[PDB]
RNA sequence: CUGAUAACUUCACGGCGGGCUUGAUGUCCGCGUCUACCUGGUGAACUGCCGAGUAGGUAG
């Protein structure tokens, strides 16, 4: 994966006046990254999650092969999923967690 | 077969000094609660005797 600096420009110069939807992520050698990380030097506005997470009630109820895995706890997974978003990790990492699990049973 | 593989942010700290919320006040007038009601122990634990005895005892 690489980072398109048209999407880095587009998300920056449209999110510079709303603060409920933007999280600032800094870097320390702005000159080596190129002029895009020098003009807005350091800042990098990128699409915060939107609100604090809310936990409603789960369900309101009364072949096959369905396996469960209850309450996995993760300590310190990264949130910078795309180069432009911040929040829940990329769901291709939830895919790799499954496919590295099905190769262990095989 | 996971923006893959590995990863110590740390050390130090005095928020302080002073202070008048006050003055005045009419909640009032009127008022019909009422009519009717089954709780059901059959005979069933009976009769003496001592003691002055509404105490006490004692018989089959």
Please check whether residue A86 is in contact with residue A47, taking contact to mean a CB–CB distance below 8 angstroms. yes
Closest-lying nucleotide for A101 based on CA to C1': B1
Neighbour tally for A90: CB within 10 Å:
16
- For residues A73 and A78, what is the distance between their CA atoms, to the nearest angstrom? 14
Short-list A49, A33, A46, CA closest to A82: A46
Residue A75 to residue A58: CA distance in whole angstroms: 23
Is the CB of residue A98 inside 7 Å of nucleic acid strand B? no
DSSP H helical segments within chain A, as ranges?
7-12, 36-39, 91-105
Residue pair A77/A89 in contact by the 8 Å Cβ criterion:
yes
Method by which the model was determined = cryo-EM
Q: Which value in Å is the resolution of this experimental model?
A: 3.2
Closest CA to A98 of A78, A73, A69: A69
Q: Is A100 exposed, middle or buried (0-12, 13-18, 19+ CB in 10 A)?
A: exposed
Q: How far is the C-alpha of A64 from the C-alpha of A9, rounded, in Å?
A: 48
Strand B closer than 7 A to residue A99 Cβ: yes
Q: Both tokens of residue A104?
A: 């262990």
């Amino acid at each position: 994966p690489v980072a398109s600096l048209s999407m880095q420009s587009h998300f920056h110069q449209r999110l510079q006046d709303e603060n409920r939807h933007s999280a600032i992520t800094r870097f320390s050698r702005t000159t080596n990254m190129g002029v895009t990380a020098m003009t807005c030097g350091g800042a990098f506005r990128m699409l915060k999650s939107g609100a604090k997470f809310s936990s409603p009630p789960h369900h309101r109820l009364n072949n096959g092969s369905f396996l469960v895995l209850p309450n996995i706890r993760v300590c310190g997974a990264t949130a910078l999923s795309s180069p432009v978003t911040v929040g829940i990790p990329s769901l291709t990492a939830f895919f790799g967690f499954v496919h590295a699990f099905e190769r262990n049973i095989n």
